[PDB]
């Protein structure tokens, strides 16, 4: 190229100046770019550490407990690793030749329900599959989505149906380890870390209940698209109830200049907890609307409500109105008719409707677009937010439910869900068998945790 | 050991925090007649808040 | 259907927790943005002052930084690809295709360095470029980056000979590569050229030979042989046309004089690369490599690269990609990273135990980076909370630390792919060779005074 | 259900039912005792639910 | 938002006023339902035509 | 006030030829049900209430 501009071309832009430019730029106290102010930070280090198991040997379908190790000034990261067993179908299965076996969608975020973190012997936090799905679908940092969908299953290999050994597809589901991070209040932000050095009189422990492998495997019919429970004799090698699972946590070490200075002082921290409303069964054939009474304690921040298809326990994370069916090419395909069962929703305080009967698309798209860091890519996942930024650790606008009386949420169902509830569909239509749906509501609230005299407690409770 | 569930409150939050917010009405100029006039001859008006 | 007055119960709800969180005379509020003035300036792009030779393939040329600019804060290199046409006189006959290597840029350039006068300041290469782009890429710009540097699914598509069905030629389009430098890392870090009238700044860029930049693949046996001038039409143009551009900013006369004649201290990040270590999985399964770094290291990236053929590049998988249906390139079914486990040793003190490769691949990027790689390999470990943060975080200095070692245990797939015996289009039809590469990212300090610069600690 | 059916009557009652049903939860140590024992009033307690 | 003029229709301009009684307005969006399209075999393009 | 101008439905439907790749304007008789000039639409906004 022939660039005749040169440096001198910008002198005119520098020279041009008016009252607007004087008001915006300029001034003796105005800061400038190209100069970064540097400030010292604390001297520390971090390194992974094994978590000490104190409850027998982990196994599928059982509950196992692991303590938090000492000697670390702070713990700010926790994850679980689990090696899945090798699955190979047999021709002697109940379904015969017309039968495939595949892992359920979202293998992780499944088989981990009611995971809890307890101080001493007091339940401090607890989450489950619905909260995990909603949080990872609403506050997902883009760019790491591929990594998450490769590390928690759904890697397009574990979820592909595999025919019997004597059929065309004799591939066996690989046995590869998978990892699931544990979302806790200390793991939410670096600034919130557990003072293990300051809490020596409480046993910090993590209780994790896995799920039976019977309902973790989807046993699909090749032609009619039906699901039946899996048995031990159906697959080669049986079912191994025991499994090797580990918990890893990251510790941080700091110098004596402050690790002892901050000790002996009362510290108040703000944390985010979970409250889950009881699940209600919905039958669209009889009723067109369903009211759910919600009762919560502290300043709620967000409300996630979804309707889940619970026809088969084997299939999970199915918020569509029609169950998935097998498709050509040894792959699973969403059926032609697959829409969220909720047609509209509204929120009522006392006898006054704060939110009118707004459309489902509102909660589906508009609210995530404005008050979230991501928009879900799957049907369902309806959200309301009382705060400008859901994912912000700093408190934002929120309404306390302790002083608020009974509140209700009314969901008006869709004709697609109504017609899908009744069966009669042909093969591979998803709704060939009658469908049953359940409504789940999850809330996120703030709380205050106080550390004093080597122990922690809730000053408000 | 007071908690949220066992409090004697609820239903009274409006009367407790009744001063958190108020309602704003449309602005209106105050046009009032000063004198009605003498034998229906004179008279004038004054705008208090134009 | 609700109205504004439908609320007010949210405001009526106000307890001790709400008093602690919200409220207060000194409490800040939203819906009000405190506006503060900033400096008056402007920016514009310029070329880089050519002071040494002309660009050519396989040679190294250095370009000076233009003066008379208040601040320079950017740098990119543009280069136009030549035209490639296949001929029936190829050594492979009809069963032969030519295609551009994957990641055309991040290749064709090695040992790119920035020098003050002639004192080396920092330097990067293919491994560091690939690792940084795969670990710290902001989404939304991923497609743009994968378009500006090649990887357009047009250069990498194999093209058969003229007599075959595929007679398409590789288009000649210009591609641009940004240069990751300490001044380009952050806006607040820029070269004060007005404060430095004595020193002169050079960028040394070394190209790569055109033989290994093109992949000549046999679509039947999946073998790669070096290309020659007679194979392609026209010939191999040794000389190439390339330029370097940079964005220069100007500041106000009121404060340039005030800031002139002072002392400044800056913090920058540098890159160190350990020599490549040839690994032979046939002899054993464990390989130990000593790491010798100097300054306060912040992150480490270690990979194993298949180095069987120089024509194919940026292939950190045990099996080389082969041809496929539709005149495309695809990776064979058996394709895993050769590394199975890794560990660190700080003078007979195992810092990290024999962790799985999946840990380095996923968990560390998920927690201490802005992105997660979408390709095999690219294993990292960072001592700092945020890799991409210019501001310093927790790190360890290797100057006061003794010798440290990294141990890697390979995989059964790697050891079986090391030997030959592969079938047609299986990737491992020929014996494979692997090289371990380790790179480190650290910190440093730059002092500006008396119109000159130098490292206070050297 | 067998908890309420058997364990609670075994500890906080003078008899155990011999028929199906009849599930019990007692806040006090002895149901039959006329002297007051541990018990909470529902007047000050916001409406509870049984599932 | 309180409609003040115009009937929402294709090819016309309509105005909507901002409701009062609030304090801050910090968002705005529009919603509209598209009609249903049903191509006919009697179109000018005949069979070779897609809408 | 907020003023919104909505174009006619003619400049919203693409009527593409199957083979020759030609585009011609749409007509009322081309599609069934006519061309409903009226449309269902509203405008929403979010308000924020602060302390007295």
Structural commentary:
This is part of a larger assembly, with five copies of chain A and one copy of chain B (50 residues). Chain A is mainly beta and 461 residues long. In chain A, 12% of the residues lie in helices and 33% in strands. Chain A contains eight helices and 24 strands. Chain A has helices spanning 10-15, 19-24, 129-138, 145-151, 185-188, 256-259, 360-371, 415-421, and strands at residues 44-50, 63-67, 74-83, 100-103, 113-119, 122-127, 177-181, 194-195, 204-209, 217-220, 245-254, 267-276, 280-282, 289-294, 299-309, 325-327, 331-333, 342-349, 352-359, 382-385, 399-400, 407-413, 437-452, 455-457. In chain A, strands 12, 13, 15, 20, 21, 23 and 24 form a seven-stranded antiparallel β-sheet that branches. In chain A, strands 1, 3, 7, 8 and 11 form a five-stranded antiparallel β-sheet that branches. In chain A, strands 2-9-5-6 form a four-stranded antiparallel β-sheet. Helices cover 8% and strands 18% of the residues of chain B. Chain B has a two-stranded antiparallel sheet. Chain B is rod-shaped, with a radius of gyration of 25 Å. Classes of the chains: A mainly beta (461), B mainly beta (50). The B-D interface holds B 5-6, 8, 10 and D 44-46. Chain A: Residues 258-457 form the Major capsid protein C-terminal domain. Chain A: One of its GO terms (cellular component) is viral capsid. Chain A: It comes from Singapore grouper iridovirus. Chain A: One of its GO terms (molecular function) is structural molecule activity.
SSE arrangement:
The structure is cut from a larger assembly and holds five copies of chain A and one copy of chain B (50 residues).
Chain A: H1 10-15, H2 19-24, E1 44-50, E2 63-67, E3 74-83, E4 100-103, E5 113-119, E6 122-127, H3 129-138, H4 145-151, E7 177-181, H5 185-188, E8 194-195, E9 204-209, E10 217-220, E11 245-254, H6 256-259, E12 267-276, E13 280-282, E14 289-294, E15 299-309, E16 325-327, E17 331-333, E18 342-349, E19 352-359, H7 360-371, E20 382-385, E21 399-400, E22 407-413, H8 415-421, E23 437-452, E24 455-457
Antiparallel strand pairs in A: 1-11, 2-9, 3-7, 3-8, 3-11, 4-10, 5-6, 5-9, 12-23, 13-23, 14-22, 15-20, 15-21, 15-23, 16-17, 18-19, 18-22, 23-24
Chain B: H1 13-16, E1 31-35, E2 44-47
Antiparallel strand pairs in B: 1-2
PDB class: viral protein
Keywords: Singapore grouper iridovirus, capsid proteins, viral protein
Entry title: One asymmetric unit of Singapore grouper iridovirus capsid
């Amino acid at each position: 190229c022939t660039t005749g501009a040169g440096v001198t071309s910008g002198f005119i832009d520098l020279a041009t100046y008016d009252n607007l430019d004087r008001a915006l730029y300029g001034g003796k106290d105005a800061t400038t770019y190209f100069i970064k102010e540097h400030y010292p930070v604390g001297w520390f280090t971090k390194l992974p550490t094994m978590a000490t198991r104190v409850s027998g040997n982990p196994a599928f379908g059982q509950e196992f407990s692991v303590g938090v190790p000492r000697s670390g000034d702070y713990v700010l990261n926790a994850w679980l690793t689990l090696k899945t067993p090798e699955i190979k179908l047999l021709e002697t299965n109940r379904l015969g030749a017309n039968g495939t076996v595949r892992w359920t969608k979202n293998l992780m975020h499944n088989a981990v329900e009611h995971a809890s973190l307890t101080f001493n012997d007091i339940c401090a936090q607890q989450f489950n599959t619905a909260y995990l799905d909603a949080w990872t679908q609403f506050n997902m940092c883009e760019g790491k989505r591929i990594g998450y969908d490769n590390m928690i299953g759904n890697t397009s290999d574990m979820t592909n149906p595999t025919p019997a050994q004597g059929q065309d597809g004799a591939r066996t589901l690989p046995s590869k380890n998978l990892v699931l991070p544990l979302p806790f209040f200390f793991s939410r932000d670096c600034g919130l870390a557990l003072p293990t050095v300051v809490l020596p009189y409480n046993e910090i422990r993590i209780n994790i209940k896995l799920r039976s492998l019977q309902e973790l495997l989807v046993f699909q019919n090749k032609d009619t698209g039906n699901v039946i429970p899996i048995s031990a004799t159906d697959i080669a090698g049986g079912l191994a109830d025991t499994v090797e699972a580990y918990v890893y946590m990251t510790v941080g070490l700091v110098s004596n200049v402050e690790r002892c200075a901050m000790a002996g002082t009362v510290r108040d921290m703000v944390v985010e907890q979970m409250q889950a409303a009881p699940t209600h069964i919905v039958n669209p054939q009889n009723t067109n609307n369903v009211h759910v009474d919600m009762r919560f304690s502290h300043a709620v921040k967000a409300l996630f409500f979804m309707v889940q298809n619970v026809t088969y326990k084997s299939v999970g994370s199915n918020y569509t109105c029609v169950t998935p069916v097998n498709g050509p090419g040894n792959t699973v395909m969403e059926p032609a008719m697959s829409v969220d069962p909720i047609k509209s929703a509204s929120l009522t305080y006392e006898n006054t409707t704060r939110l009118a009967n707004m459309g489902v698309e509102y909660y589906s798209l508009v609210q995530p677009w404005y008050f979230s860091a991501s928009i879900p890519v799957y049907t369902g996942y309806h959200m309301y937010s009382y705060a400008l930024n859901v994912g912000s650790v700093h408190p934002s606008g929120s309404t306390n439910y302790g002083r608020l009386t009974n509140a209700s949420i009314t969901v008006t169902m869709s004709p697609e869900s109504v017609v899908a509830a009744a069966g009669g569909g042909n093969n591979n239509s998803g709704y060939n068998e009658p469908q049953r749906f359940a409504l789940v509501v999850i809330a996120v609230n703030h709380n205050v945790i106080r550390i004093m005299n080597g122990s922690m407690g809730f000053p408000i409770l | 050991c007071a908690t949220y569930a066992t409090r004697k409150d609820k239903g009274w939050e409006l009367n407790e925090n009744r001063c958190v917010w108020a309602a704003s009405v449309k602005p209106t100029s105050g046009a009032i007649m000063t004198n009605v006039g003498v034998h229906g001859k004179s008279g004038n008006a004054v705008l208090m808040t134009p």
